[PDB]
Structure 1
Amino acid sequence: NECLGTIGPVTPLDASDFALDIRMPGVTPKESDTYFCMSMRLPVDEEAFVIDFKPRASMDTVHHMLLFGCNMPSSTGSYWFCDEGTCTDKANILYAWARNAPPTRLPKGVGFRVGGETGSKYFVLQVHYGDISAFRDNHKDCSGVSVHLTRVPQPLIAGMYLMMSVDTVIPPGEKVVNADISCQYKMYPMHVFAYRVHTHHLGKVVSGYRVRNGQWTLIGRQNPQLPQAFYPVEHPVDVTFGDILAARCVFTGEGRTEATHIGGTSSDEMCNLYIMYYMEAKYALSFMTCTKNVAPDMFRTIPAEANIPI
């Protein structure tokens, strides 16, 4: 969408609300599959809540976009290459826009807390450019996201539960390799409303479950070779103190001459499940992570759907 020029990136909406436009600074990629990142410091120091996102993408050039909150972006520059980087501290995903899979709105009453003493001080925007045939006129791209911020405290607070593999090894030619992740939940209740899967080219299927008294309840199941948007949960699912969260990525090693481990390049793999939730404001925390497998034997009773392509 058009570069903003003289009016700048901040639009006053109310005596308590404003829109912040986070856009690439007129970039022109020279190669296919280029990842550009840029950052924006929040204009306010006090606590604010992110309550809406509007995509400002070219429907010709942009393949996907992600928006993160963090305190230390990887570069102090105007823009940089980030094949998967973003920040030096923890990059907290807030929004995904995927071509051919339209985003779903935040439920009303729900917001991410940012700024203040403990919230993100920066937004970091990652834009993935696919086919660069539309850049033949050498035009400058200002694609990005418009974010609606308010100072009005929200009754429900949005957060992310990230489940990720660390130790996976996929030997070459191997028909099937499973990456299993599991943790005990020990916070106040969260309600999952959306999910995103992330794998590289070897991933076949990713599934996430809440396990309670041995019973498996589906959160999300998706082919990671399909556009990696945040997809809505079929049915709102609570996760409560005592529950186990379990996830499985199914990989193959076929077409590879050497072993494939977890890493940041296309020659490596990832097994990431992003579980987007809301919590009551007075109970809420903004992020949780599972990088372990605390109940490995539990996976004997995983539903069969977790083992076959969607």
Structure 2
Amino acid sequence: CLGTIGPVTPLDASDFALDIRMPGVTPKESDTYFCMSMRLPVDEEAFVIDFKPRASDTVHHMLLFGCNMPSSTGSYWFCDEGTCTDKANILYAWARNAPPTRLPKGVGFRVGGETGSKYFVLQVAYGISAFRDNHKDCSGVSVHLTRVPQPLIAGMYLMMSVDTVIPPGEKVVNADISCQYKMYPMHVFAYRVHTHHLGKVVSGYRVRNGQWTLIGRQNPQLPQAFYPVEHPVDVTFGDILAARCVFTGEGRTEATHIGGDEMCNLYIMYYMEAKYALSFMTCTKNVAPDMFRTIPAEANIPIPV
């Protein structure tokens, strides 16, 4: 917190580093989520091509989002209040002991410009010793940006459930998500799963001509970082993306709805060739419910915490 680093560090003619660091916060109670924003210093298009975590020891988890309207203009805030008022687009997730895993060579997220995010929003989640004379913490992430066009553009394919209810006691409830893919090819290289306490497992697949290829499979009670996809999965025009979240209602007194409460989110991080690329994409439907009768057995086997 006596760093001399400077928020923008020029690197060479076309690149700069952005240091995104909590402005000296004091985590009070445990499980505390703090948020801060950082404006891109350029107006034109740039590419985020690398990330370096600068985490304290006590930092459990960090997320980085791109958006155009952070939820506060304050120095920092509590993320309970929200991340961005507009769509918060996840770019990066770090968890202690997870390998955060790198952007592949030639891949960048596109920001700035007419259609790219104007701000980053950083979230830092703290795990706290009750002495320390109000310790100041400046955890965060350094971001590497370039104005040199990248050949491959990263983006997020967000699958989410909204139609499903968990009746009390049911032990096993499936929430299924599926959409037809109709863009240029995307190549999936990482995934993140999100659910609250009732989630057991979250699985994502590419389905082509009735054959299922796993994108990724994880227990959402583990740290919600981005996990790497072993061998990147090409998703192409005509494929279906399918995801299933497995819930419990055991110990529940009343029904639980999948709506912010429970959630079934699968973040599929991809790249696409630059000239055909888009930054986002979402599925919020179950268009092919019948196909889940053929889902691989593995999508139902638990992954204990």
RMSD: 1.3
SS of residue paired to 1:194 = strand
- Is contact 1:61-1:134 (8 Å) kept? no
The residue number in structure 1 matching 2:6 is 8
TM-score between both structures, scaled by the size of structure 1: 0.95
**Cα distance between partner residues in 1 of 2:140 and 2:25:** 12
SS of residue paired to 1:135 = coil
Out of 260, 272, 296, the residue aligned to residue 265 of structure 2 is 272
Deviation sequence 1:225-256 (CA, Å, 0-9, x none):
11111111122110000000000000001122
The residue number in structure 1 matching 2:251 is 255
TM-score between both structures, scaled by the size of structure 2: 0.96
SS of residue paired to 1:133 = coil
Deviation sequence 1:26-71 (CA, Å, 0-9, x none):
000211111111101101111100000000001x211100000000
- Is contact 2:107-2:151 (8 Å) kept? yes
- Unpaired stretches in structure 2, ≥5 consecutive residues: none
SS of residue paired to 2:130 = helix
Please state how far the C-alpha of 1:284 moved relative to its aligned partner. Answer: 0.6
**Cα distance between partner residues in 1 of 2:18 and 2:81:** 24
Q: Once structures 1 and 2 are overlaid, which stretch shifts more, 238-247 or 83-92?
A: 83-92
**Cα distance between partner residues in 1 of 2:300 and 2:152:** 35
Against the structure 1 CA distance between its residues 289 and 135, is the aligned structure 2 distance closer, same or farther, given a 3 Å change threshold?
A: farther
Deviation sequence 1:149-182 (CA, Å, 0-9, x none):
0010001000100000112211111111100000
Identity %: 100
**Cα distance between partner residues in 2 of 1:306 and 1:91:** 28
**Cα distance between partner residues in 2 of 1:262 and 1:183:** 18
**Cα distance between partner residues in 2 of 1:77 and 1:46:** 25
- Is contact 1:57-1:144 (8 Å) kept? yes
Please state how far the C-alpha of 1:102 moved relative to its aligned partner. Answer: 2.0
**Cα distance between partner residues in 2 of 1:152 and 1:176:** 49
**Cα distance between partner residues in 1 of 2:274 and 2:284:** 26
- Is contact 1:28-1:138 (8 Å) kept? yes
Deviation sequence 1:190-227 (CA, Å, 0-9, x none):
01011111111111110000011101011001111111
- Is contact 1:64-1:129 (8 Å) kept? yes
Please state how far the C-alpha of 1:280 moved relative to its aligned partner. Answer: 0.5
- Unpaired stretches in structure 1, ≥5 consecutive residues: none
Query: Are residues 1:24 and 2:22 paired?
Result: yes
Deviation sequence 1:266-293 (CA, Å, 0-9, x none):
xx21111010001010111111000000
Q: Once structures 1 and 2 are overlaid, which stretch shifts more, 187-196 or 78-87?
A: 78-87
Query: Are residues 1:285 and 2:278 paired?
Result: yes
Out of 31, 34, 37, the residue aligned to residue 35 of structure 2 is 37
Please state how far the C-alpha of 1:6 moved relative to its aligned partner. Answer: 4.5
**Cα distance between partner residues in 2 of 1:165 and 1:136:** 43
Please state how far the C-alpha of 1:83 moved relative to its aligned partner. Answer: 2.8
